[PDB]
Design an enzyme around this catalytic site. Sequence first.
Site, PDB file in Angstrom:
ATOM      1  CB  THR A 165      38.676  12.866 -31.953  1.00 54.62           C
ATOM      2  OG1 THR A 165      39.121  13.163 -33.512  1.00 54.62           O
ATOM      3  CG2 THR A 165      39.632  13.159 -30.957  1.00 54.62           C
ATOM      4  NE  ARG A 166      38.675   7.126 -37.289  1.00 59.85           N
ATOM      5  CZ  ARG A 166      38.333   7.887 -38.354  1.00 59.85           C
ATOM      6  NH1 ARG A 166      37.264   8.489 -38.313  1.00 59.85           N
ATOM      7  NH2 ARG A 166      39.034   7.817 -39.477  1.00 59.85           N
ATOM      8  N   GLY A 179      28.767  14.587 -34.190  1.00 63.39           N
ATOM      9  CA  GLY A 179      28.704  15.576 -35.595  1.00 63.39           C
ATOM     10  C   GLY A 179      28.427  14.738 -36.664  1.00 63.39           C
ATOM     11  NE  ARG A 180      30.091  14.850 -42.926  1.00 61.88           N
ATOM     12  CZ  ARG A 180      30.074  14.133 -44.259  1.00 61.88           C
ATOM     13  NH1 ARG A 180      29.028  13.967 -44.961  1.00 61.88           N
ATOM     14  NH2 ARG A 180      31.275  13.607 -44.412  1.00 61.88           N
ATOM     15  CG  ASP A 181      30.366   9.386 -41.707  1.00 55.77           C
ATOM     16  OD1 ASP A 181      31.330   9.298 -42.386  1.00 55.77           O
ATOM     17  OD2 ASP A 181      29.453   8.363 -41.278  1.00 55.77           O
ATOM     18  CG  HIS A 182      29.954  10.400 -33.732  1.00 61.64           C
ATOM     19  ND1 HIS A 182      30.117   8.865 -33.295  1.00 61.64           N
ATOM     20  CD2 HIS A 182      30.382  11.117 -32.838  1.00 61.64           C
ATOM     21  CE1 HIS A 182      30.652   8.857 -32.070  1.00 61.64           C
ATOM     22  NE2 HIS A 182      30.726  10.145 -31.731  1.00 61.64           N
ATOM     23  CB  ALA A 183      31.475   6.213 -34.878  1.00 59.87           C
ATOM     24  CG  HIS A 232      42.608  19.645 -38.879  1.00 55.95           C
ATOM     25  ND1 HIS A 232      44.233  19.701 -38.886  1.00 55.95           N
ATOM     26  CD2 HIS A 232      42.405  18.432 -39.447  1.00 55.95           C
ATOM     27  CE1 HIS A 232      44.646  18.499 -39.380  1.00 55.95           C
ATOM     28  NE2 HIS A 232      43.473  17.924 -39.729  1.00 55.95           N
ATOM     29  CB  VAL A 262      31.833  22.491 -38.378  1.00 61.71           C
ATOM     30  CG1 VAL A 262      32.722  23.820 -38.308  1.00 61.71           C
ATOM     31  CG2 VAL A 262      30.886  22.641 -36.990  1.00 61.71           C
ATOM     32  CG  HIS A 320      38.010  18.894 -35.496  1.00 61.26           C
ATOM     33  ND1 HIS A 320      38.799  18.872 -36.575  1.00 61.26           N
ATOM     34  CD2 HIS A 320      37.175  17.989 -35.943  1.00 61.26           C
ATOM     35  CE1 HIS A 320      38.418  18.032 -37.526  1.00 61.26           C
ATOM     36  NE2 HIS A 320      37.509  17.412 -36.930  1.00 61.26           N
TER      37      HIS A 320
END
EC number: 2.7.7.4
Lengths: 510, 510
Positions: A195-196, A288-292, A200, A330, A203
């Site tokens: 994570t960056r 997850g979705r659109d990782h990095a 919330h 999610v 997550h």
Amino acid sequence: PAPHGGILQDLIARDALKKNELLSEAQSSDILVWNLTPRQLCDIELILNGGFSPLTGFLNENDYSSVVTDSRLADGTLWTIPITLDVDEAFANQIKPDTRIALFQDDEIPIAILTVQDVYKPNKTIEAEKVFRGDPEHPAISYLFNVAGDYYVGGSLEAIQLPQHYDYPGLRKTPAQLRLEFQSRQWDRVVAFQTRNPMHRAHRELTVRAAREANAKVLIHPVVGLTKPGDIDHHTRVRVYQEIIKRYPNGIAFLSLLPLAMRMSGDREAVWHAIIRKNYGASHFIVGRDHAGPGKNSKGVDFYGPYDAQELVESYKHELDIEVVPFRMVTYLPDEDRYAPIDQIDTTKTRTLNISGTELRRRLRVGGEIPEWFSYPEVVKILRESNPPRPKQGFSIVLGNSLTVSREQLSIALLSTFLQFGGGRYYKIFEHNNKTELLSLIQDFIGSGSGLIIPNQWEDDKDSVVGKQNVYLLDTSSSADIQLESADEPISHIVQKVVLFLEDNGFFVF
Amino acid sequence: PAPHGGILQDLIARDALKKNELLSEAQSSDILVWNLTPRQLCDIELILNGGFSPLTGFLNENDYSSVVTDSRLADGTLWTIPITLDVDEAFANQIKPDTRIALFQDDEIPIAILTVQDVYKPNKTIEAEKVFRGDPEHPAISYLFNVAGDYYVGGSLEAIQLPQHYDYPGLRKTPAQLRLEFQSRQWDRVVAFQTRNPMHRAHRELTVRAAREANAKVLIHPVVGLTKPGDIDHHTRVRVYQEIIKRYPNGIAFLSLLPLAMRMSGDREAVWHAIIRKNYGASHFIVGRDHAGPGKNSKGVDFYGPYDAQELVESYKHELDIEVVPFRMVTYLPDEDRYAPIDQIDTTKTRTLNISGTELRRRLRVGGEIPEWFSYPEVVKILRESNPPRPKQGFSIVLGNSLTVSREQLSIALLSTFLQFGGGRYYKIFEHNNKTELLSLIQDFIGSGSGLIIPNQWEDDKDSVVGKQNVYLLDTSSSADIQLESADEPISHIVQKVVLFLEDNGFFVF
Ligand SMILES: Nc1ncnc2c1ncn2[C@@H]1O[C@H](COP(=O)(O)OS(=O)(=O)O)[C@@H](O)[C@H]1O
Ligand SMILES: Nc1ncnc2c1ncn2[C@@H]1O[C@H](COP(=O)(O)OS(=O)(=O)O)[C@@H](O)[C@H]1O
Ligand SMILES: [O-][Cl+2]([O-])[O-]
Ligand SMILES: [O-][Cl+2]([O-])[O-]
Ligand SMILES: [Ca+2]
Ligand SMILES: [Ca+2]
Ligand SMILES: [Ca+2]
Ligand SMILES: [Ca+2]
Ligand SMILES: [Ca+2]
Ligand SMILES: [Ca+2]
Ligand SMILES: [Mg+2]
Ligand SMILES: [Mg+2]
Ligand code: NA
Ligand code: NA
Ligand code: NA
Ligand code: NA
Ligand code: NA
Ligand code: NA
Ligand code: NA
Ligand code: NA
Ligand code: NA
Ligand code: NA
Ligand code: NA
Ligand code: NA
């Protein structure tokens, strides 16, 4: 799992008894010295501690091109992000193979000794297109063309010490230390969460579900090295993580800071992340979705598909040797007060809710109330505190060049006017005299929440020294943020225009 | 500092390669087995991990008596608390020197192999008087005569594994692990704070002052092994510590749980504590007022002087090889809102404030408001939650023997009566039939907050199976908590008497 390549390349451990010798060579007046750039400091730390196993230095041309065109090191080892030492022509010209260079931090702390293997001039266009997908707006591509050196120096490292950090001394665990951490706890199953951004509610649920699916402990492994431009600073994020970690059941999660320098390279980065977490002792890695992914470009199109990373990671599945726990968007379920993967609901039969980071900034910048369901209160508090709403933000009013009235008097008028509003903001008429030592301070004040009244513009050759943020131009020009009727409009009129503009943009609230 | 005796006796490390072999001997049907008592489990763990360096087993008579009469091991090593393996005559008789015994935990987990050196019968009165100062009410003395075996078994140990713990796996750091912790952080000056009570504001200030005075990092090193009877359980305390640790500046303190079994031995224990903290890697150790002291006896006299520990520790100063940071009564200063050592104020010129633990229980038991200055709110919350006020406490009403009315009808009457009050309390007519398996449950319900109506007393031989806590006797006797006029007083009369009594003691609030 076994570190990538089979051997953890902890060079600090490896070169320990050479510490004193390497240090003497590093400070000898004859050796050539290169002061590491910030991103390089991040990379150098992950190479010396084993985080980038099997790497043991910066990629030579052979391995570098193999990674660009094959997503593999020359020897076939799976590796998607090129890690190179970028320098300028000047420095590049003073080195040849076999040469030994001293790598310093802050032109003062010697980090390592690099033994040169080659000095090449990469085709940044290819790297940009094959590695980062070509879009000029992509963060990695902008860095490569505007910040990175035009020369790469492949070569092996001999560690003196990891880069210096005075913050969070306890938390930046090295692969060796993390593994020990997990062991002392008898943790043989650990799912890592990259994570960056601040975490919330979504997550927290995302990570716990993963913990439950994988039957493993949770490792919050956030990046505090270098992320997407405009991200929340890591200090604030660390405070957020430390706070949210308390919402996990006792003894289920561990927090460790990763001094990684992201490239925001979607799918490829995902692969790289998985390799990195494997070296660090994780047995599972979330994707997850659109990782990095860096979102969309100015034209609204996606840099990566929301699930390209998942697909790519899936395809290298049998050789990553670390299990990937994939997640679909999610999201929030009002009517049932709970989150859930979008892949296991919808059908219109169920109504969802989603506060994108975009709109999240919006409320933070507008003092808006952020949903109890969206994020924990203690967290929002820390965020607002680091990113205050407009009425607590600083700003600057620049008296345009076209201005005909007395700049001295218009300045005082604005000062005295702002002063009567009260609200804790500090104000100042700030004269820069085109001295960059003064210009570079403008954003410091705005950052400190002060309001600056600048009587003159700075020459265009200096415009780059000043951060455009919350800086408004008062002028007759069409490109003025606050447009005047005529260059000689009377002060009280100009004043009302400025005040009402600032009021309209939330800086003043009555 | 160097561990006491010069060598950290981490036997887990030492005996590693004998693990399997020792394990086999431990479970062989021929070896003699002793199941470790709770206190012994605490001691055995500090012996096997190096915490009690230079010890490597339980004291033989020679070392034991040297500690009793000389505060030193037979070889002169400064050591004030005797660590012995106390057993009963039955077991004592089955062993001779050279014999090897298997030490188990829960008659299931093999902990270590003790090679017998000798089996003796200590004169508990001398130990009681020379070591703990003789007062029969002193916690250690009471344990020695009422719980300790009458035989001690001196002998050396060979570690199989430290005693098993399923709570706070990450926090119970061993001396070896703590030292590594301090190193990874480059902590070379660390002042340790001992404690068995929850930490309040005074303590936080006390520890920060010490951190400032010694120019050292803070180690909160709380005891979760065994403490003064009636202390707050360690689970609640650990929650309190983890909460209060957040009030320290980022990265100044570290928390670690110490599975020590205290003897509440004032000055001697303070010496012992300092030796133990030195083994654990501390460079400084705090010794405040009445350190390790059990307060006053039933007659109101002190077990130790409020500063005896400081004096004793001061006298061994040159050979403790760990610097002691002494503190005088730290107290509150209303008029200036701050705490300070009483030794640097008073003169009547300044007015102080002090909420003794005594009165602290009082408010906790009476739902009273506990001062914002005294303790942090999040802490009091945790405490109230573990030690609820009377209106949320459980209790028992035992229908006395002298009772002439229908016990069946009086029971029902009280049940129906209590039922109409409401307030979340669960009620039950509880018939024990003198069966200890039922009697032993009485305090479980009370602990759970329930109210019990017990129609009959239990035979005096069983009285010990039941905890006297919140258990009231309804009877005509003078020793009845709720005294009846006559044994045949009509039910409604007895009921009103019981209700008003409970109301008077806060169990009911209308
Ligand atoms: N709503 C979500 N659904 C699924 N995965 C998510 C969601 N939000 C974040 N993630 C995942 O959480 C991890 C880190 O998220 P971010 O900090 O936003 O960005 S990232 O650049 O590190 O991926 C990534 O694996 C990302 O795909
Ligand atoms: N008001 C105070 N002034 C000075 N020292 C104190 C004070 N309160 C507690 N201490 C010190 O704090 C440490 C641990 O306190 P406690 O948990 O209450 O008791 S002890 O049994 O561990 O000594 C000891 O060194 C003790 O003397
Ligand atoms: O969620 Cl963060 O982008 O504020
Ligand atoms: O300080 Cl404790 O006695 O509650
Ligand atoms: Ca260039
Ligand atoms: Ca999209
Ligand atoms: Ca005009
Ligand atoms: Ca006895
Ligand atoms: Ca006294
Ligand atoms: Ca009568
Ligand atoms: Mg570092
Ligand atoms: Mg244990
Ligand atoms: Na310098
Ligand atoms: Na091209
Ligand atoms: Na699996
Ligand atoms: Na795609
Ligand atoms: Na494997
Ligand atoms: Na508007
Ligand atoms: Na020493
Ligand atoms: Na059993
Ligand atoms: Na000192
Ligand atoms: Na005394
Ligand atoms: Na000494
Ligand atoms: Na009364």
